[PDB]
Amino acid sequence: GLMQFTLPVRLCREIELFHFDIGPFENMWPGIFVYMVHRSCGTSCFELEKLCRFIMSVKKNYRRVPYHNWKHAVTVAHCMYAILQNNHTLFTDLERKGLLIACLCHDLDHRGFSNSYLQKFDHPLAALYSTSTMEQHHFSQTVSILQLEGHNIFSTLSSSEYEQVLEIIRKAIIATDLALYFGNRKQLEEMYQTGSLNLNNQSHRDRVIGLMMTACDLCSVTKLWPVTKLTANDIYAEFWAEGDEMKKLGIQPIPMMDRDKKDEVPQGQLGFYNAVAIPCYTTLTQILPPTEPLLKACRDNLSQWEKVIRGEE
C-alpha cells in the first residue's frame, strides 16, 4: 500500500517526456510499468501482488522476435502514459486503467508476421479470425491471462465496470490494426473540421482512443534520431524475414519486405512518415493539443530520413 516505486533521478525526469527510451535493462521494465500505473491511476487501482504477477505472465507470452517483443509492449505503454499525463482531466478512471494494460498486451504472442502472411500461409488463426487476425488473437491472449488464478487485476471492479474495461481494451487492441487506422483518422479529421466532434459521444471517444493507440504503437518514429534509426533495423529485420517466407511460398513480396531492395528503405520511410505517421500525429494534435511534441519529433525524424536519401548520412 505505502510501497511506491521510485526511479533514479534521470529516469524520474525523463520518463515524463514523450521521447523517453526505456533503456537496455530488461529487468527494470516491469518497475517502469508499475511506476507508470501508480502515477497515472493511483497506488490503489491494482493490487500490487496481482499486478506484478500479471506483468510477468504478459512478458512470458511475448516472443523473442526482433521488433514485436516485450520492449515494444512497454515502450507503447509508456507513450500512452505520456499522453494520459498530459491530458489529465480528459479521461475517466477506468479508461486510464484499461489503456495502459491494453498497450502492454496489444501485441501478445506476436510471431513477427503480418495478417497478410498468415492469410497467404493459411495459418489457423486466419480461419478463426478473417479480419484483424493477429489483433483478435492479442485480445484473446489478454483475456486468457486475466483468467489465470491470481491474475485478475480487475477483481475489485463491479460487474459493469468489468465489462466496461474489457470492452475498452478490446476496442483499443483491435484499433492497432493499421488497416483500420486510415478510415478512423479520416473520420476524425472530417468530424474535427466540421465541428461535430463530441467527447461525450461514446462512439467518438472510441475513435479518439483508437487514434491514441495508433499514435503509441508508432511512437518509435517520435524518439530521438538515434533511437528511431536503430529501432528501424529491428522493424526491417521482421519485414525481410517475412519477405523470405513469402518467397518460400512462391510469392514475390512487396519491395518493403524484400532484402534485395534494401537500398529503397529511406524512400520507404518517407512514404510511411507522409502516408501514416505525419497524418496520425497531426490529427492527434488537433484533437489533443498537448500531444504536439509527438508531431514535432516525428517531423524532425522525417527530415533526418530526407538527409539520408540526399547522401548527407
Ligand X SMILES: O=c1ccn(-c2cccc(OC(F)(F)F)c2)nc1-c1nc(Cl)[nH]c1-c1ccccc1
For residue 137 the three cell numbers come to 488473437
Q: Single out the segment in contact with ligand X by CB under 6 A; choices: 30-38, 51-59, 164-172, 271-279.
A: 271-279
19 is in an annotated binding site: no
Among the listed residues 2, 91, 74, 8, the one whose alpha carbon sits nearest the alpha carbon of residue 43: 2
Question: Applying CB under 6 A, does 134 fall inside the site for ligand X?
Answer: no
Whether 19 and 299 have beta carbons less than 8 Å apart is answered as: no
CA gap 175, 168 in Å, rounded:
11
Whether 237 and 113 have beta carbons less than 8 Å apart is answered as: no
Query: Binding partner of residue 235 among Zn ion, ligand X, Mg ion, none, CB under 5 to 8 Å per kind?
Result: ligand X
Query: Binding partner of residue 5 among Zn ion, ligand X, Mg ion, none, CB under 5 to 8 Å per kind?
Result: none
In b/e form, how buried is each residue of 48-61, taking b as 16+ CB within 10 angstroms?
eebbbbbbeebbeb
217 is in an annotated binding site: yes
106 is in an annotated binding site: yes
- What x/- string results for residues 162 through 201 when contact with ligand X is judged by CB under 6 A? ----------------x-----------------------
For residue 90 the three cell numbers come to 480528459
C-beta of 157 vs 276, nearer to ligand X:
276
- Of the chain, the end-to-end C-alpha distance in Å amounts to 51
Whether 79 and 20 have beta carbons less than 8 Å apart is answered as: no
68 is in an annotated binding site: yes
Q: Single out the segment in contact with ligand X by CB under 6 A; choices: 11-19, 163-171, 218-226, 280-288.
A: 218-226
Query: Binding partner of residue 22 among Mg ion, Zn ion, ligand X, none, CB under 5 to 8 Å per kind?
Result: none
- One of 68, 78, 110, 151 is an active-site residue; which one? 68
Angle between the N-to-C axes of helices 70-86 and 48-60, in degrees from 0 to 180, rounded to the nearest 10: 130
Query: Binding partner of residue 275 among Mg ion, Zn ion, ligand X, none, CB under 5 to 8 Å per kind?
Result: ligand X
Question: Applying CB under 6 A, does 276 fall inside the site for ligand X?
Answer: yes
For residue 296 the three cell numbers come to 514535432
The correct pick among 217, 238, 301, 305 for binding Zn ion (CB under 5 A) is 217
For residue 204 the three cell numbers come to 467518438
Query: Binding partner of residue 143 among ligand X, Mg ion, Zn ion, none, CB under 5 to 8 Å per kind?
Result: none
Is 38 labeled as catalytic in the residue annotation?
no
Q: How many degrees, rounded to 5, is the angle at CA 64 between CA 136 and CA 83?
A: 60
For residue 3 the three cell numbers come to 510501497
Q: Which residues 6+ apart lie within 8 Å of 123 measured at CB?
A: 117
Binding site for Mg ion (CB under 5 A): 107, 176
122 is in an annotated binding site: no
The correct pick among 272, 279, 299, 306 for binding ligand X (CB under 6 A) is 272
The correct pick among 107, 135, 177, 238 for binding Zn ion (CB under 5 A) is 107
The correct pick among 11, 22, 157, 235 for binding ligand X (CB under 6 A) is 235
Residue ranges that bind ligand X, judged by CB under 6 A: 178, 218, 220-221, 235, 256, 268, 272, 275-276
The set of catalytic residues is: 68
